[PDB]
Amino acid sequence: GLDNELSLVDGQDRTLTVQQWDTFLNGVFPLDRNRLTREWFHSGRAKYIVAGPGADEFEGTLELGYQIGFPWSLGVGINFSYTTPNILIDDGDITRPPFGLNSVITPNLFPGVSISADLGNGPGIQEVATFSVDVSGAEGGVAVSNAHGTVTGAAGGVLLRPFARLIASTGDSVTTYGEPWNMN
Amino acid sequence: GLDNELSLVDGQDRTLTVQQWDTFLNGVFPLDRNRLTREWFHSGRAKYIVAGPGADEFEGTLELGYQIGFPWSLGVGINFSYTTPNILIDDGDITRPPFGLNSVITPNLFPGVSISADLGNGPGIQEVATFSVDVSGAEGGVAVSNAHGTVTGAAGGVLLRPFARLIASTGDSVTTYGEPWNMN
Amino acid sequence: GLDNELSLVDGQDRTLTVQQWDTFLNGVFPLDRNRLTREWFHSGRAKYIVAGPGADEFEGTLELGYQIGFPWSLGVGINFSYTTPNILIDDGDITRPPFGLNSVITPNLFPGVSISADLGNGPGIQEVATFSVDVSGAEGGVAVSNAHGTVTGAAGGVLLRPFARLIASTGDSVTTYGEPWNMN
Amino acid sequence: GLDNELSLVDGQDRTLTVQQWDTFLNGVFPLDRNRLTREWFHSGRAKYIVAGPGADEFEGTLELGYQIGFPWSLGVGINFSYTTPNILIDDGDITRPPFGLNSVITPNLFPGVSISADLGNGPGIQEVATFSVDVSGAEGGVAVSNAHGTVTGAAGGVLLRPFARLIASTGDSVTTYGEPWNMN
Amino acid sequence: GLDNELSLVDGQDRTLTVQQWDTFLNGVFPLDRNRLTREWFHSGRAKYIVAGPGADEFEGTLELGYQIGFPWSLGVGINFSYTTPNILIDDGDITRPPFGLNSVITPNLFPGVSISADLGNGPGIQEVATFSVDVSGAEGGVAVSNAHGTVTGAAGGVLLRPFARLIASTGDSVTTYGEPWNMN
């Protein structure tokens, strides 16, 4: 049904209304099985109405999309390393027995694994446009089912804020916002 | 209502007036729940008037926007690391017992976390144009409701200064400035 | 046969149906004989139907493809090194015998090999379009046999999710998704 | 009023005069509250006169702007860091009590802050064009009120030198310069 | 003769057949005499047939080429170095004889050579198009003799998989693959 709506008396006395219908953000288990990944499908409709002078020769653009935000970037690195046995002489006496072999340095003698995880402030708030298209005339107009979206390297919970926007060819714009959906 | 206004007698004797109406910069809790992020919605109208010779065949551009300034950039990094037990021989004697095992170096024996926060001078003062469009004739013209803006990696308070600008196709320009809004 | 299907009543009352037929993602032993490489062949058909007003003057785009996800990036590096024998004097006395040769540093005395493997979080979820083409009229339309796909530096299992997409010239879109195929 | 003026007998015997009127560079407290930032508003008019043969079919370009110079770049960085307690064994004996725990290295035991400020020779002298536009005919033409300008990372005093320039379509040019304005 | 063939009933009921004839991949001793280099000459023909409705007004693209894969990248570096004799005083006493010359550090006393070879996972599977050209009508069409191909920095054996591809202007595609040729 109708999720949300906003109206604007524009700069040439037209009433511009933009609406969001049937919005669904469907979070799924990530294809990559990566705990830092989020993945979802966006369905919904954007509609517009224009009333007042010139209503029928209205030219504009209609968009549907979402903003996304999460607090931290996270990366994880795991290293395996091994180095074959060796010796270098360090502060050794090579003039007489045992020729500096009483003062050697070796590499690490065993194979080893190390892990390193980095957490930093996130990339901020981003905007995705599911569609952005030309419309004309007083009413319309556009619907989407099962558009795909994803983000990775994310931690602390991913929030998605759906919007619909109408921009008049004339410069005027109104956008309506919905309640956010939690991908965590 | 009318927020602010400015007039200019231009280079061919036209009086150019640009105005800001109904301005609202609405700071909200950030979608990304990041203390270094600020997020807001811009509403307002820009109007112009042109008087004197040629008024009716005026060609121009109308803009509405804001400048943003904050004093410091801030970044935060937290690292978790652990390395598997190992030894290397350092200045050891491999000719006789105990074959240098009386002088070893190991990696850190425990898992460890470290935090690093960097504060530096900020990126200076930036300008955003919420809309910038062609206008013609003596009066107009353009309105916006709930346009979105954001910035991250910011500290010490974010200030937003709203403006409206009129540029004549002829080169002349006047811009009016409003009272700043505090996002912190 | 028919694998999967989805319908949408669009923004101007047309019923848009997109379908996936005969889908085969054929994983093969990799040409490069690299355990971090995966390689496959994509076959299938995408069909569409449009019903309701204007059905016959429908303009659109039809795509067939897949998303790919795997959890980890992996890289492996093996180094062989050898350095010719040398000495430098370190904290040596050059005023008297044996002129500092009782305190030398050498390079590693033997040839050596070392291995280093790095595992990190993967690149997230990617989309590939096997074909994306213009279609017009009420029904169609497009088939592919043995298109090639590949990815390398991958670990933890590669998953492929096939889709078909129909985008109306009018902005409306519907995409249908199939059951994923395992390349590991 | 008239601030400054310059004339040139050009390459085809036209007298070209360019003038600066009503120039004001208004330094303000920086929106970003950053001591390395300067911010100002430029108002003024540029006029031109062309006399001699062909005066009425003169084609050219008119500009108004300023050069900016300051002696030093300055940046400031403040780091906070803390690392969780740890030990590695350094030149320790692991064959017998106390197993090398008599020779350990730790990280810094306390949290710490460090500051680093860098001062270097500045970026040199830069030119900003407030407007740059086509003019035609013997007289004109162009005015600006409250154009915005800023610079950051600056130290040692910021000077602004206003100019007006006329370039004939024919190649000839004259520019007039004003007295500089101090932003510190 | 005919090496391999594949057919497809396309999205508008045309039968599309693509074929590979007379394929020869001729591996030669590399011009650069570099053991990490492979070099070869590709000869062959691609043909196509289209049957069913509209056969004679078929528009498309014909390609011939190969995929290449090898498991490892390899690089080798050899350094020669020598440094002229010198001394620095390290932890020396300059208040009394012999003024710290009893505790010096020198550079390496001899000339030296070191070798370093790096082996890492390879670049994955790549595609080369020997030709890719427009065709029209029901049958054709294109042949190549002695086209050149090469790759360097390769180890573990280089495999080359020949293909021919037909893409209809309409989106449909079929590609046929041959048996791979070993460049090692």
Next chain:
Amino acid sequence: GLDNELSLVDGQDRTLTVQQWDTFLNGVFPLDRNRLTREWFHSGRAKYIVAGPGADEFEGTLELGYQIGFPWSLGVGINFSYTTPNILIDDGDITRPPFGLNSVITPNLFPGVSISADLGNGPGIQEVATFSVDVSGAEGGVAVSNAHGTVTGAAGGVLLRPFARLIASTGDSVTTYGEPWNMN
């Protein structure tokens, strides 16, 4: 007056003459008050004459400018740093009093300033074109007053060599050079 002149009998028997008149390179105290900056104003005229066959339908390009050279690049960097008091234990015994506090490392105990100046060979000899424009017919043509030029990071004296150039649409060219002006 006339500064300098050069003539060329070109490839189709036209005599091409290019001349420099009234040349002034006016060095001023730098706007940025930076000892590594030089700043100046260029005034002058370039004239051409063409004689012989086709003189009146001559098409060309006329330029006026200078080359600049200085021997050294110079940069200066001054750092202020301070680090808060801390300790780490280095080769300490943590099994018994005083728990390694008899062997600590600290950061620098005082605030500190350091200066670093780098002198290197300069960027070589550069060419600036004050104007470069199309001319037609047997005589002309172009004049400039108070064009601006600058350079920074310079040491050892900045030299400016003025020139005028005429390029025929036919490829032929002649350039005349003046006596250099010293900006140091």
Next chain:
Amino acid sequence: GLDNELSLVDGQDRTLTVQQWDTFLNGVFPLDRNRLTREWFHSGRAKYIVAGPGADEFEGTLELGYQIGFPWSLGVGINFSYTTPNILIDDGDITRPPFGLNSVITPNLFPGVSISADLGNGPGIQEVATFSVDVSGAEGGVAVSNAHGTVTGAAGGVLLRPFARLIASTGDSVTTYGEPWNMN
């Protein structure tokens, strides 16, 4: 005279012949007197013939060039350095005579030169096109005298393999190869 030749029955039954005549690759002592540089002059002619249906309305491209290969890249670096005398106190006692001057570190006391030569695997096999031009009709067509080629940073001998190529506008191609010329 005729150096080499190759024929192909193409995809529409035309016999395509490409030929190399009078080929000379003239190695000279390098202008830069650099032992890692090679320099040469290429002379030769490329001819084509087309027989069978449509021979006279043949459209194509004719090229002449060479491939170049050498086994190793080589670079050489020589550094001169000197540092003015200095001291720092290292593990010194500043509470009592001689105030740590019994334990100083200095820089290198003498001026010094060091040389570093790096040999690595070469850049592989490259192709240069001396000319590549449009041809039409049954026979032609193109000749070159003393075209220049060069390469630097090369070691182990530079080999040049001359070719001529004919590409039909229809996609078909044949290339003929000559005996290689040694630039070392």
Next chain:
Amino acid sequence: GLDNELSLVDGQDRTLTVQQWDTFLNGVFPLDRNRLTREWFHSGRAKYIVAGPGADEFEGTLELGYQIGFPWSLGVGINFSYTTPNILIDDGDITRPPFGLNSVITPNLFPGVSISADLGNGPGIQEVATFSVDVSGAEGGVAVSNAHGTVTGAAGGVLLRPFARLIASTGDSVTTYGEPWNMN
């Protein structure tokens, strides 16, 4: 006068002759007074003659220029540095007098200068085109006086090899070379 000449019977039986006349490369003391810089002025004429069928409707390109080569790149860097007096405690006992002040590290106690010069193999052989222009008809055509050229960072002597080139619109080319001029 005539310096050098070369002729070619081209691919369509035209005799193509290209010539160099009046060539002068005038080395001067470098404007930048930099010993690694070379600077010169190029004067000369290129002529061409075409004989045989179609001579009068010949279309082509005429160039005049030089190759440049020198064996070494050279760079020089001089650093001045000073650091204000400081102390850190190294392996000090802070539990009892004198609290680790018996084991300190300082920065260098004096101001210091260091020089570093790097010599490496040169950039190879480069080509400059003084002019490159369209010509038509059987004879011409183009002359240059006092064109400027320069290079810096050079050592071991700079050689300049003058050439003239004629390229037929048809692909054919001949170039003639002169005796080299020494800029050292």
